[PDB]
Design a protein around this nucleic acid. Structure first.
Ligand SMILES: [K+]
Ligand SMILES: [Mg+2]
Ligand SMILES: [Mg+2]
Ligand SMILES: [Mg+2]
Ligand SMILES: [Mg+2]
Ligand SMILES: [Mg+2]
Ligand SMILES: [Mg+2]
Ligand SMILES: [Mg+2]
Ligand SMILES: [Mg+2]
Ligand SMILES: [Mg+2]
Ligand SMILES: [Mg+2]
Ligand SMILES: [Mg+2]
Ligand SMILES: [Mg+2]
Ligand SMILES: [Mg+2]
Ligand SMILES: [Mg+2]
Ligand SMILES: [Mg+2]
Ligand SMILES: [Mg+2]
Ligand SMILES: [Mg+2]
Ligand SMILES: [Mg+2]
Ligand SMILES: [Mg+2]
Ligand SMILES: [Mg+2]
Ligand SMILES: [Mg+2]
Ligand SMILES: [Mg+2]
Ligand SMILES: [Mg+2]
Ligand SMILES: [Mg+2]
Ligand SMILES: [Mg+2]
Ligand SMILES: [Mg+2]
Ligand SMILES: [Mg+2]
Ligand SMILES: [Mg+2]
Ligand SMILES: [Mg+2]
Ligand SMILES: [Mg+2]
Ligand SMILES: [Mg+2]
Ligand SMILES: [Mg+2]
Ligand SMILES: [Mg+2]
Ligand SMILES: [Mg+2]
Ligand SMILES: [Mg+2]
Ligand SMILES: [Mg+2]
Ligand SMILES: [Mg+2]
Ligand SMILES: [Mg+2]
Ligand SMILES: [Mg+2]
Ligand SMILES: [Mg+2]
Ligand SMILES: [Mg+2]
Ligand SMILES: [Mg+2]
Ligand SMILES: [Mg+2]
Ligand SMILES: [Mg+2]
Ligand SMILES: [Mg+2]
Ligand SMILES: [Mg+2]
Ligand SMILES: [Mg+2]
Ligand SMILES: [Mg+2]
Ligand SMILES: [Mg+2]
Ligand SMILES: [Mg+2]
Ligand SMILES: [Mg+2]
Ligand SMILES: [Mg+2]
Ligand SMILES: [Mg+2]
Ligand SMILES: [Mg+2]
Ligand SMILES: [Mg+2]
Ligand SMILES: [Mg+2]
Ligand SMILES: [Mg+2]
Ligand SMILES: [Mg+2]
Ligand SMILES: [Mg+2]
Ligand SMILES: [Mg+2]
Ligand SMILES: [Mg+2]
Ligand SMILES: [Mg+2]
Ligand SMILES: [Mg+2]
Ligand SMILES: [Mg+2]
Ligand SMILES: [Mg+2]
Ligand SMILES: [Mg+2]
Ligand SMILES: [Mg+2]
Ligand SMILES: [Mg+2]
Ligand SMILES: [Mg+2]
Ligand SMILES: [Mg+2]
Ligand SMILES: [Mg+2]
Ligand SMILES: [Mg+2]
Ligand SMILES: [Mg+2]
Ligand SMILES: [Mg+2]
Ligand SMILES: [Mg+2]
Ligand SMILES: [Mg+2]
Ligand SMILES: [Mg+2]
Ligand SMILES: [Mg+2]
Ligand SMILES: [Mg+2]
Ligand SMILES: [Mg+2]
Ligand SMILES: [Mg+2]
Ligand SMILES: [Mg+2]
Ligand SMILES: [Mg+2]
Ligand SMILES: [Mg+2]
Ligand SMILES: [Mg+2]
Ligand SMILES: [Mg+2]
Ligand SMILES: [Mg+2]
Ligand SMILES: [Mg+2]
Ligand SMILES: [Mg+2]
Ligand SMILES: [Mg+2]
Ligand SMILES: [Mg+2]
Ligand SMILES: [Mg+2]
Ligand SMILES: [Mg+2]
Ligand SMILES: [Mg+2]
Ligand SMILES: [Mg+2]
Ligand SMILES: [Mg+2]
Ligand SMILES: [Mg+2]
Ligand SMILES: [Mg+2]
Ligand SMILES: [Mg+2]
Ligand SMILES: [Mg+2]
Ligand SMILES: [Mg+2]
Ligand SMILES: [Mg+2]
Ligand SMILES: [Mg+2]
Ligand SMILES: [Mg+2]
Ligand SMILES: [Mg+2]
Ligand SMILES: [Mg+2]
Ligand SMILES: [Mg+2]
Ligand SMILES: [Mg+2]
Ligand SMILES: [Mg+2]
Ligand SMILES: [Mg+2]
Ligand SMILES: [Mg+2]
Ligand SMILES: [Mg+2]
Ligand SMILES: [Mg+2]
Ligand SMILES: [Mg+2]
Ligand SMILES: [Mg+2]
Ligand SMILES: [Mg+2]
Ligand SMILES: [Mg+2]
Ligand SMILES: [Mg+2]
Ligand SMILES: [Mg+2]
Ligand SMILES: [Mg+2]
Ligand SMILES: [Mg+2]
Ligand SMILES: [Mg+2]
Ligand SMILES: [Mg+2]
Ligand SMILES: [Mg+2]
Ligand SMILES: [Mg+2]
Ligand SMILES: [Mg+2]
Ligand SMILES: [Mg+2]
Ligand SMILES: [Mg+2]
Ligand SMILES: [Mg+2]
Ligand SMILES: [Mg+2]
Ligand SMILES: [Mg+2]
Ligand SMILES: [Mg+2]
Ligand SMILES: [Mg+2]
Ligand SMILES: [Mg+2]
Ligand SMILES: [Mg+2]
Ligand SMILES: [Mg+2]
Ligand SMILES: [Mg+2]
Ligand SMILES: [Mg+2]
Ligand SMILES: [Mg+2]
Ligand SMILES: [Mg+2]
Ligand SMILES: [Mg+2]
Ligand SMILES: [Mg+2]
Ligand SMILES: [Mg+2]
Ligand SMILES: [Mg+2]
Ligand SMILES: [Mg+2]
Ligand SMILES: [Mg+2]
Ligand SMILES: [Mg+2]
Ligand SMILES: [Mg+2]
Ligand SMILES: [Mg+2]
Ligand SMILES: [Mg+2]
Ligand SMILES: [Mg+2]
Ligand SMILES: [Mg+2]
Ligand SMILES: [Mg+2]
Ligand SMILES: [Mg+2]
Ligand SMILES: [Mg+2]
Ligand SMILES: [Mg+2]
Ligand SMILES: [Mg+2]
Ligand SMILES: [Mg+2]
Ligand SMILES: [Mg+2]
Ligand SMILES: [Mg+2]
Ligand SMILES: [Mg+2]
Ligand SMILES: [Mg+2]
Ligand SMILES: [Mg+2]
Ligand SMILES: [Mg+2]
Ligand SMILES: [Mg+2]
Ligand SMILES: [Mg+2]
Ligand SMILES: [Mg+2]
Ligand SMILES: [Mg+2]
Ligand SMILES: [Mg+2]
Ligand SMILES: [Mg+2]
Ligand SMILES: [Mg+2]
Ligand SMILES: [Mg+2]
Ligand SMILES: [Mg+2]
Ligand SMILES: [Mg+2]
Ligand SMILES: [Mg+2]
Ligand SMILES: [Mg+2]
Ligand SMILES: [Mg+2]
Ligand SMILES: [Mg+2]
Ligand SMILES: [Mg+2]
Ligand SMILES: [Mg+2]
Ligand SMILES: [Mg+2]
Ligand SMILES: [Mg+2]
Ligand SMILES: [Mg+2]
Ligand SMILES: [Mg+2]
Ligand SMILES: [Mg+2]
Ligand SMILES: [Mg+2]
Ligand SMILES: [Mg+2]
Ligand SMILES: [Mg+2]
Ligand SMILES: [Mg+2]
Ligand SMILES: [Mg+2]
Ligand SMILES: [Mg+2]
Ligand SMILES: [Mg+2]
Ligand SMILES: [Mg+2]
Ligand SMILES: [Mg+2]
Ligand SMILES: [Mg+2]
Ligand SMILES: [Mg+2]
Ligand SMILES: [Mg+2]
Ligand SMILES: [Mg+2]
Ligand SMILES: [Mg+2]
Ligand SMILES: [Mg+2]
Ligand SMILES: [Mg+2]
Ligand SMILES: [Mg+2]
Ligand SMILES: [Mg+2]
Ligand SMILES: [Mg+2]
Ligand SMILES: [Mg+2]
Ligand SMILES: [Mg+2]
Ligand SMILES: [Mg+2]
Ligand SMILES: [Mg+2]
Ligand SMILES: [Mg+2]
Ligand SMILES: [Mg+2]
Ligand SMILES: [Mg+2]
Ligand SMILES: [Mg+2]
Ligand SMILES: [Mg+2]
Ligand SMILES: [Mg+2]
Ligand SMILES: [Mg+2]
Ligand SMILES: [Mg+2]
Ligand SMILES: [Mg+2]
Ligand SMILES: [Mg+2]
Ligand SMILES: [Mg+2]
Ligand SMILES: [Mg+2]
Lengths: 122, 249
RNA sequence: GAGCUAGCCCUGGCCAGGGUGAAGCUGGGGUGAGACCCAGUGGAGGCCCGAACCGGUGGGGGAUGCAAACCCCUCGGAUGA
RNA sequence: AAGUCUGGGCUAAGUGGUAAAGGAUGUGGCGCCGCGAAGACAGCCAGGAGGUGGCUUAGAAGCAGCCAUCCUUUAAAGAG
RNA sequence: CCUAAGGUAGCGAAAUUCCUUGUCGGGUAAGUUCCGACCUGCACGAAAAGCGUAACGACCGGAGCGCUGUCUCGGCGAGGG
RNA sequence: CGAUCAACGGAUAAAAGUUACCCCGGGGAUAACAGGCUGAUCUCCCCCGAGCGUCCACAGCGGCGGGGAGGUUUGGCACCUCGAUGUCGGCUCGUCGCAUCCUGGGGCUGAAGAAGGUCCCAAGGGUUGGGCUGUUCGCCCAUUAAAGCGGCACGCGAGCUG
RNA sequence: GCUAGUUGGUGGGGUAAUGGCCCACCAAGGCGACGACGGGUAGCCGGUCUGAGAGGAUGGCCGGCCACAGGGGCACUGAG
RNA sequence: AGCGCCGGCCAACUCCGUGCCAGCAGCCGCGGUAAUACGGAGGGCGCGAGCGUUACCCGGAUUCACUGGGCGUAAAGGGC
RNA sequence: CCGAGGGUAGGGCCCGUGACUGGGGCGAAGUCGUAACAAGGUAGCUGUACCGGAAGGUGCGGCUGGAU
RNA sequence: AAUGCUAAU
RNA sequence: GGCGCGUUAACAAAGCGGUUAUGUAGCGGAUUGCAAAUCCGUCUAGUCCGGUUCGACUCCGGAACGCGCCUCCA
């Protein structure tokens, strides 16, 4: 459950460290984003000389949430952070590495290159 | 263009007191040329020196075809002579600058009320029950440019609408009068430049009784005829080099 | 009518505890003598924190009230005009 | 309360029972001309042509813009 | 030209600026407020003092961190009614 | 005979201000809110067809003029209310109109397709979250099918805010 | 101006081996205008280039030494 | 067989073209209608499988002066 | 235990950059004046102070690198 | 008493 | 919008019912190597429209433009 004002850590190597959600790109008026959803976000903290910089407005897909995601098999999964991978308007990652595990829901939702690059899919 | 009346701005370049004196020579050269063209001349701005010349003169050339001919005189004009301000008999190279511009319009400015949006609303500040319930404040929006003017100066919406439209017009006017200036300014700089001894389009060498227009290589030796106004030979050679410049391909 | 309130006059009373550590003093250093430096001691102040006490900052309640100005939280002063 | 009263006409819009410029093969009544079996009006049947364009235009050459719109087999065919 | 003489230093869109959300810069994803500038100061200005200033303030602005039922957006529970 | 007793039937021989510290008697005889009447202003819709649109008045437009509708604005008037009809914005809760923002159905198009323009029908439902400012309004950010405009005492303070 | 393993001691760990190298404790010392500390820059020398010499500049090839082996830390094995 | 150069420093000069233009340039300077200084040409000077240029080091620099400089008025005696 | 490093917070130095602002060097021509060089037309210069569009002026004291 | 004189060997 | 004041030549600015304002500039001359400064001379006028009067820049009325002041209780 990500919404405007929500901070997310960045699970890639674009140079962004913290993005702040400003929109849930999910119809007219989605209240929340979960794993596999895309947000528009402001870049609140970045490391020097990265792809993206502080103040940029970027797009990202959510890859981990602290609110547990439930699964049709009756199970659930929960992460210690809210994390996202910065993408372009074609949904492809903009960095070349993805740090940490990601939800298997991303595979189902066409974020295959991200699933590819993640060290663990859970 | 070619057929409209023209304005000529003669400025003194490098040369000091004698640049202004040469500018006076170019001034008499064009007033007397104009008579030998039927063109009508009137001074619009003059700035004389006590030694006899001008640091700047502006004059119009009222005649059906003035820009077509005078337009070749724009540029830096170089004189080399022993100046009347010189006392050791030396030859000084000095410059005057000629600017040739088509006589602008004067077109009046009114508002196209179809590209204007008027918002009315309640005003801010004191008034009691009146200011609470009255749409006295006005905003006027110039829809193309986007610039707005607001007014709650009075208690009346109609007076604030009138005053707001006035200020909006006055401001769009200054915007129009300023882009016109930036075109006028850059154009002048394309013709007059810095006025340096280079940049010359023509030399009027008094020692060697020569006049050379280094744009086409034309050189006559009727320097007294040139300075008295007989510039038709030079223009034509430019005019003919102009058409031979339109030979494609 | 100054048994409310305001000012002044006379005569009394009150201010838990904790903190900071001025001058001075003493010693040491320094010097021609000094200034001054350092340590210790010392205990100054419309100094600090905080009860009583004096207040009344923000909020909530109260609003035919418990109350014709109150109640709860919070907050200012608290050796000084 | 008192006529589903009598006679003549109009309206088809519930107009009556909420309005203007203006628009209209709504309907009914007057007119005033015109064309008709010298076969009218509508339809169909053809013919509707030619020197072919003149100015303008690479063609605008019957079917852009300009200038007038000359004449034939004839019953008519206009350079439209 | 006029005045008794024509606003100096410093400051300035200000507790002062009507036009005005002036313009530029900063901060914000986005800033009528804020801060830094510019100066055509409607209508600053030198003890109705001018411009600054450590410390102080239950004074009035603007921002960030922390944290939150303020809010998305409400849920449940307690007691007095 | 002495009057700009000119406020000219001329209060004294002799007279200016201020009150947001205000007070009393009065008035809806008289203003400010809201209603009402009106509709100049405002908003919308038509008539005319000069001209634009390469061509072509009418795809889209409409010179100079003309006729209306609405009753959101600014006014005019002063009719209930001055022994009181609480006045902005926000919040909350809606409900209605339709001159329709979206979604549905159309005709025309200067409609190839896709996407638009324009007009017609249509009010069932929908019509986002933020930055600025008390703001209404407006601008901006990120989105959206869309981010409609209006009436209800500019809806709603014996419902809250202030 | 610098300094808390800082400077010295005692005792021990460690090594092939001395040592605050490491540790526990004791003492309050250690260093600096003869430039400590900090900042900048540099691998060093035999040589090499220049120069009358003194000096300056430099350290590529070759020889000697050091340092490093993607960026860091670590030890194992072993005569090393 | 090529490349640099031919105002002065510096060895090597005339003609034309250009007319403060085009350009040369290490310094001082050339070029504004008779330019050994710009561009070509002829001729000349220097080197030659090379010739020039740019960067940098030492030299000239006795211009950081130990060798081997200075401070009245040139930069330089500290106010005492 | 130490520990590569990662993280949190606060300092220090350095570089680049910034609305605007300050003066500085330069220029074959501009505006104002004419302070200095002659006793430069008020000897100059000087530290400092105050003032003035500007060079500058004036006060106080110093110097001669001052004329006759 | 009384200000000034650009710029080409 | 109201009230007040004004419009004069090249600029600035006055008086006045009949009539060279004035300053500076400009123009001619002098002086100066030249230019300034200076000296002798000299010159260009009343915003528009309508009235009054023998006669209007001058007085009255209005128009345009400029300036100064006011626009408050809601
Ligand atoms: K009042
Ligand atoms: Mg991570
Ligand atoms: Mg990261
Ligand atoms: Mg940042
Ligand atoms: Mg930033
Ligand atoms: Mg990425
Ligand atoms: Mg001279
Ligand atoms: Mg409108
Ligand atoms: Mg209002
Ligand atoms: Mg306000
Ligand atoms: Mg008031
Ligand atoms: Mg108030
Ligand atoms: Mg009203
Ligand atoms: Mg008492
Ligand atoms: Mg008592
Ligand atoms: Mg006592
Ligand atoms: Mg006490
Ligand atoms: Mg105590
Ligand atoms: Mg105490
Ligand atoms: Mg303490
Ligand atoms: Mg105590
Ligand atoms: Mg003590
Ligand atoms: Mg003590
Ligand atoms: Mg004592
Ligand atoms: Mg002592
Ligand atoms: Mg003591
Ligand atoms: Mg104490
Ligand atoms: Mg105290
Ligand atoms: Mg206290
Ligand atoms: Mg304390
Ligand atoms: Mg306290
Ligand atoms: Mg008490
Ligand atoms: Mg009390
Ligand atoms: Mg009290
Ligand atoms: Mg209280
Ligand atoms: Mg509170
Ligand atoms: Mg209360
Ligand atoms: Mg209360
Ligand atoms: Mg009460
Ligand atoms: Mg009661
Ligand atoms: Mg209480
Ligand atoms: Mg209590
Ligand atoms: Mg309490
Ligand atoms: Mg307290
Ligand atoms: Mg207390
Ligand atoms: Mg206290
Ligand atoms: Mg106490
Ligand atoms: Mg006492
Ligand atoms: Mg019947
Ligand atoms: Mg009958
Ligand atoms: Mg009908
Ligand atoms: Mg009908
Ligand atoms: Mg009916
Ligand atoms: Mg009807
Ligand atoms: Mg003032
Ligand atoms: Mg003064
Ligand atoms: Mg002063
Ligand atoms: Mg000032
Ligand atoms: Mg300002
Ligand atoms: Mg501002
Ligand atoms: Mg201020
Ligand atoms: Mg002010
Ligand atoms: Mg303002
Ligand atoms: Mg304002
Ligand atoms: Mg703004
Ligand atoms: Mg910004
Ligand atoms: Mg930041
Ligand atoms: Mg801004
Ligand atoms: Mg705010
Ligand atoms: Mg500011
Ligand atoms: Mg300004
Ligand atoms: Mg003041
Ligand atoms: Mg005051
Ligand atoms: Mg005063
Ligand atoms: Mg201040
Ligand atoms: Mg200070
Ligand atoms: Mg302060
Ligand atoms: Mg302070
Ligand atoms: Mg205080
Ligand atoms: Mg206090
Ligand atoms: Mg206070
Ligand atoms: Mg904040
Ligand atoms: Mg925050
Ligand atoms: Mg916070
Ligand atoms: Mg709650
Ligand atoms: Mg809400
Ligand atoms: Mg409950
Ligand atoms: Mg209960
Ligand atoms: Mg009178
Ligand atoms: Mg009377
Ligand atoms: Mg009277
Ligand atoms: Mg009478
Ligand atoms: Mg009387
Ligand atoms: Mg009397
Ligand atoms: Mg009286
Ligand atoms: Mg009174
Ligand atoms: Mg008051
Ligand atoms: Mg008051
Ligand atoms: Mg009172
Ligand atoms: Mg008072
Ligand atoms: Mg009273
Ligand atoms: Mg009273
Ligand atoms: Mg009263
Ligand atoms: Mg009363
Ligand atoms: Mg009464
Ligand atoms: Mg009434
Ligand atoms: Mg009456
Ligand atoms: Mg009213
Ligand atoms: Mg009323
Ligand atoms: Mg009213
Ligand atoms: Mg109302
Ligand atoms: Mg009313
Ligand atoms: Mg009513
Ligand atoms: Mg009506
Ligand atoms: Mg109407
Ligand atoms: Mg109307
Ligand atoms: Mg209509
Ligand atoms: Mg057309
Ligand atoms: Mg058409
Ligand atoms: Mg129209
Ligand atoms: Mg009408
Ligand atoms: Mg109408
Ligand atoms: Mg109404
Ligand atoms: Mg009506
Ligand atoms: Mg109404
Ligand atoms: Mg009214
Ligand atoms: Mg009304
Ligand atoms: Mg009323
Ligand atoms: Mg009446
Ligand atoms: Mg009332
Ligand atoms: Mg009653
Ligand atoms: Mg009643
Ligand atoms: Mg009542
Ligand atoms: Mg509604
Ligand atoms: Mg409809
Ligand atoms: Mg639709
Ligand atoms: Mg549709
Ligand atoms: Mg289509
Ligand atoms: Mg298409
Ligand atoms: Mg359509
Ligand atoms: Mg609907
Ligand atoms: Mg919105
Ligand atoms: Mg914020
Ligand atoms: Mg807001
Ligand atoms: Mg707003
Ligand atoms: Mg607004
Ligand atoms: Mg859209
Ligand atoms: Mg759509
Ligand atoms: Mg209301
Ligand atoms: Mg409303
Ligand atoms: Mg309400
Ligand atoms: Mg209330
Ligand atoms: Mg309310
Ligand atoms: Mg109510
Ligand atoms: Mg009520
Ligand atoms: Mg109620
Ligand atoms: Mg009620
Ligand atoms: Mg209030
Ligand atoms: Mg309040
Ligand atoms: Mg140890
Ligand atoms: Mg050690
Ligand atoms: Mg010890
Ligand atoms: Mg040593
Ligand atoms: Mg390094
Ligand atoms: Mg190195
Ligand atoms: Mg070395
Ligand atoms: Mg050697
Ligand atoms: Mg040597
Ligand atoms: Mg090397
Ligand atoms: Mg390494
Ligand atoms: Mg190694
Ligand atoms: Mg390594
Ligand atoms: Mg590598
Ligand atoms: Mg490695
Ligand atoms: Mg050579
Ligand atoms: Mg030679
Ligand atoms: Mg050469
Ligand atoms: Mg060289
Ligand atoms: Mg030349
Ligand atoms: Mg020649
Ligand atoms: Mg020559
Ligand atoms: Mg030659
Ligand atoms: Mg040479
Ligand atoms: Mg040559
Ligand atoms: Mg060889
Ligand atoms: Mg040497
Ligand atoms: Mg050298
Ligand atoms: Mg020596
Ligand atoms: Mg020497
Ligand atoms: Mg010297
Ligand atoms: Mg001495
Ligand atoms: Mg560590
Ligand atoms: Mg670390
Ligand atoms: Mg500057
Ligand atoms: Mg002088
Ligand atoms: Mg002097
Ligand atoms: Mg002189
Ligand atoms: Mg003098
Ligand atoms: Mg002098
Ligand atoms: Mg004398
Ligand atoms: Mg002095
Ligand atoms: Mg003075
Ligand atoms: Mg003399
Ligand atoms: Mg003079
Ligand atoms: Mg001068
Ligand atoms: Mg002289
Ligand atoms: Mg000069
Ligand atoms: Mg000279
Ligand atoms: Mg006059
Ligand atoms: Mg004038
Ligand atoms: Mg006068
Ligand atoms: Mg007079
Ligand atoms: Mg005169
Ligand atoms: Mg003269
Ligand atoms: Mg003269
Ligand atoms: Mg007359
Ligand atoms: Mg007249
Ligand atoms: Mg007259
Ligand atoms: Mg007149
Ligand atoms: Mg008049
Ligand atoms: Mg009042």
């Amino acid at each position: 459950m990500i919404q405007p004002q929500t901070y997310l850590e960045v699970a890639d190597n674009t140079g962004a460290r913290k993005i702040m959600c400003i929109r849930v790109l999910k119809g007219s008026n989605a209240k929340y984003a979960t794993v596999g959803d895309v947000i528009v976000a402001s870049v609140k903290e970045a490391i020097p000389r990265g792809a993206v910089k502080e103040g940029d407005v970027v797009k990202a897909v959510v890859v981990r949430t602290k609110k547990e995601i439930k699964r049709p098999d009756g199970s659930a999964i929960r992460f210690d952070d809210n994390a996202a991978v910065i993408i372009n308007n074609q949904l492809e990652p903009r960095g070349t590495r993805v740090f940490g595990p990601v939800a298997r829901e991303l595979r189902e939702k066409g974020f295959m290159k991200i699933v590819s690059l993640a060290p663990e899919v859970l | 263009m070619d057929e409209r009346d023209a304005i000529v701005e003669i400025r003194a370049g490098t040369g000091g007191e004698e640049a202004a004196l040469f500018a006076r020579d170019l001034f008499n050269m064009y007033l007397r040329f104009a008579e030998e063209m039927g063109f009508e001349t009137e001074v619009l701005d003059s700035h004389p020196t006590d030694l006899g010349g001008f640091s700047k003169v502006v004059f119009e050339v009222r005649g059906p075809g003035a820009y077509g001919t005078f337009k070749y005189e724009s540029g830096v004009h170089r004189v080399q002579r022993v100046p009347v301000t010189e006392t050791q008999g030396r030859i000084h190279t000095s410059t005057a600058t000629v600017a040739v511009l088509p006589k602008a319009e004067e077109e009046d400015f009114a508002l196209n009320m179809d590209e204007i949006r008027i918002d009315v609303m309640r005003a801010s500040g004191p008034g009691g029950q009146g200011v609470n319930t009255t749409d006295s404040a006005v905003r006027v929006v110039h829809l193309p440019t986007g610039i707005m003017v607001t007014c709650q100066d009075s208690r009346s919406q109609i007076k604030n609408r009138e005053k707001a439209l006035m200020i909006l017009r006055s401001r769009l006017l200054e915007m129009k009068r300023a882009e016109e200036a930036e075109r006028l300014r850059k154009t002048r700089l394309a013709q007059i430049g810095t006025g340096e001894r280079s940049e010359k389009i023509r030399t009027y060498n008094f020692p060697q009784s020569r006049v050379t227009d280094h744009r086409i290589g034309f050189t006559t030796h009727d320097l007294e005829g040139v300075l008295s106004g007989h510039l038709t030979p030079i223009l034509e050679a430019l005019k003919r080099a102009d058409q031979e410049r339109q030979l494609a391909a």
